[PDB]
């Protein structure tokens, strides 16, 4: 299905990162939407990602008692690069 | 293995069967993969849906005696 | 499960009930004590409406209730649909074709297997009749005798246009579904419905 975009809280450990994913959900009774935030242990060989980064999260075979997820370069994002002003 | 057989429904003394494709180790009325035919002795109502039967027989489904003979009368074994 | 009690009584209290009795009530002779309840609570009015219905057709309450659920299910005007349902009953169509003296008589007839619906014997009163249906007497001596003497000696020709009758074999025929104006009694169905809002 659709992979999960999130941002990195902790880069400290080797070949791993700790990602925070925020997703919105329409709370079952009262119909307003709420932010629920979950953490993930993501497998990242090469240790390319640092703290603060915005990274897409992919699914794969289990690499540990926790990490099921492969750290993947951000899928698509609006360029923060300056655009023309017509 | 996969077996095409009768599953018993209706009520006391009045019996009506569905013809169904189901793994042989499930119970007699238990859950199944596909419903295919319909059968009944007293109203002498019998008819089937042949593409399904053929698609299961193709993948190796074994019928049971009663069912086997029902398929015989409707000539599903000749097309095979 | 049937009302074997005094008729004239329920007649006095409720009103005129065709399906019960052809004998007009006594002067009533209650003018001595002049005892009244005062007037009737709205509840009593509604209750007597329902009771009217129920006793005209010989139906039990718990039966009436499920008829009413059927009614609330059906798509259309509730009270009307109800009255349809009550008026298509077999002993009732039997009565209203004058094949019987009254509804208890017609019920007795139906019950003893003296009737045929499309060459098939139906002995249960509540059998629901559907359009294009043949109401016949069983071909035996006694059945014919009953139907003949109860048909001929009663002069009334009111037949309400959905009901056909033919002379020698005495083939009754149900033509169609009842019309609200063709109903067998004077009743505000609105009241019975309002009573049944609480079930």
């Amino acid at each position: 299905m659709r992979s999960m975009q999130g941002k990195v809280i902790c880069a400290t450990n080797d070949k791993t990162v700790n990602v925070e994913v925020v997703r919105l959900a329409p709370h079952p009774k009262y119909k307003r939407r709420v932010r629920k935030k979950k953490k993930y242990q993501a497998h990242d060989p090469d240790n390319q990602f640092k703290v603060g980064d915005w990274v897409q999260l992919d699914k794969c075979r289990p690499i540990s008692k926790t990490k099921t997820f492969l750290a993947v370069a951000p899928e698509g994002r609006q360029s923060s690069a300056t655009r023309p002003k017509p | 293995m996969v077996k095409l057989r009768l599953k018993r429904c209706g009520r006391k003394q009045r019996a009506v069967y569905r013809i169904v494709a189901i793994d042989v180790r499930s119970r007699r009325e238990g859950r199944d993969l596909q419903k295919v035919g319909f059968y009944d002795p007293i109203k002498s109502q019998t008819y089937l849906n042949v593409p399904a039967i053929l698609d299961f027989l193709e993948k190796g489904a074994q019928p049971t005696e009663t069912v086997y003979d029902i398929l015989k009368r409707a000539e599903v074994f000749k097309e095979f | 499960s049937r009302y074997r009690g005094p008729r004239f009584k329920k007649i006095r209290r409720l009103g005129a009930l065709p399906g019960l009795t052809n004998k007009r009530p006594r002067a009533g002779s209650d003018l001595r004590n002049q005892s009244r309840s005062g007037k009737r609570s709205q509840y009593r009015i509604r209750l007597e409406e329902k009771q009217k219905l129920r006793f005209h057709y010989g139906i039990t309450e718990r039966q009436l209730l499920k008829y009413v659920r059927i009614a609330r299910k059906a798509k259309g005007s509730t009270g009307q649909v109800l009255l349809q349902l009550l008026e298509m009953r077999l002993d009732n169509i039997l009565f209203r074709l004058g094949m019987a003296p009254t509804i208890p008589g017609a019920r007795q007839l139906v019950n003893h297997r003296h009737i045929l619906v499309n060459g098939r014997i139906v002995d249960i009163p509540s059998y629901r009749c559907k359009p294009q249906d043949t109401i016949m007497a069983r071909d035996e001596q006694k059945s014919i005798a009953l139907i003949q003497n109860s048909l001929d000696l009663s002069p009334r020709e009111e037949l309400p246009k959905h009901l056909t009758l033919n002379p020698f074999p005495y083939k009754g025929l149900v033509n169609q579904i009842i019309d609200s104006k063709w109903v067998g009694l004077k009743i505000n169905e609105l009241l019975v419905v309002e009573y049944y809002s609480r079930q």
């Binding site: 709370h27 009262y30 307003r32 | - | -």
Partner: protein
């Protein structure tokens, strides 16, 4: 009120509290009478009420009312008790079903007999 607050679960229901705890979710319970005695009712109702203390199968001891007129009940009798509250007497939440086990039916009651456990007279 505030939605934000309602999503902290600020609505919780008040559970149903039973009127006859000693029954423990049953229609009846059998018990043995520890004592049979009389009590005076809360004023202005004065009379003398017939009550017996019963020790039950669920272990509790309660005080239950005996209906009708007259009774044969005495200590170490096995009766059957049912729910329902007598507004008169403080603390009495239970009756004694008449006509079963050790409580006989009320003698010479002709009407509404089923409540008091009485045969139909021939």
């Amino acid at each position: 009120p505030t939605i934000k607050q309602l999503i902290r679960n600020t609505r919780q229901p008040i559970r149903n509290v039973t009127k006859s705890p000693a029954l423990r979710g049953c229609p009846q319970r059998r018990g043995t009478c520890t004592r049979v005695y009389t009590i005076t009712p809360k004023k202005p109702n004065s009379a003398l009420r017939k009550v017996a203390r019963v020790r039950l199968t669920s272990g509790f001891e309660i005080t239950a009312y005996i209906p009708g007129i007259g009774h044969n009940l005495q200590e170490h009798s096995v009766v059957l008790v049912r729910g329902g509250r007598v507004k008169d007497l403080p603390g009495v939440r239970y009756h004694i079903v008449r006509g079963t086990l050790d409580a006989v039916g009320v003698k010479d009651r002709q009407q509404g007999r089923s409540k008091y456990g009485v045969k139909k007279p021939k």
